[PDB]
Design a protein around this ligand. Structure first.
Ligand code: HEM
Length: 152
């Protein structure tokens, strides 16, 4: 798990996201979709986005980014005591959306990249370490539920 000092860094970094949740969310999803086009195919409602310009112009993509980052923020503020929050997300993403755990790795990496891109020089080495550990814990607990369901 994370130390209290590490959790404090996670939630300090998260204050940057909360100042512009929609912009961070849109950029996270765009980074995921352009870097890994197969992920776009999992969204019926985003398959029509042929270009990054269409993605950036999509108000509904920005809306979903707010949904995604609001959910992640709620989980992070539990500092690892997130079973109730995480279990339904793991179950919807395995059983309904059919999201391989690899794609959650992709989006975790996308979050780290967006943080550096929007806050260059202001996302320190300790902050990246702590946020990475928090995202790894999130992914690992999802993975446990994936394994329970036998989902690949
Ligand atoms: C930080 C990681 C993620 C979080 C917090 C997150 C959160 C959410 C939430 C809260 C919803 C709506 C409620 C639900 O269906 O459970 C949702 C829907 C969805 N998620 Fe995720 N998600 C994440 C990653 C991903 C990834 C990586 C993919 C695919 C590559 C994905 C695919 C989908 C799809 C297809 C839907 C339904 C979209 C629709 O409404 O048409 N999710 N997600």
């Amino acid at each position: 798990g994370l130390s209290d000092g590490e959790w404090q860094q996670v939630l300090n970094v998260w204050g940057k996201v909360e100042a512009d949740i929609a912009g961070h969310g849109q950029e996270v999803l765009i980074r995921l979709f352009t870097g890994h086009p197969e992920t776009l195919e999992k969204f019926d409602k985003f398959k029509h986005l042929k270009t990054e310009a269409e993605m950036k112009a999509s108000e509904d993509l920005k809306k979903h980014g707010t949904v995604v980052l609001t959910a992640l923020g709620g989980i992070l503020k539990k500092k690892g005591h997130h079973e109730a929050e995480l279990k339904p997300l793991a179950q919807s993403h395995a059983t309904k959306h059919k999201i391989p755990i690899k794609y959650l790795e992709f989006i975790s990496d996308a979050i780290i990249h967006v943080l550096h891109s929007k806050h260059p020089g202001d996302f320190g080495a300790d902050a990246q370490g702590a946020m990475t550990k928090a995202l790894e814990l999130f992914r690992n607990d999802i993975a446990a539920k994936y394994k329970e369901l036998g989902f690949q």
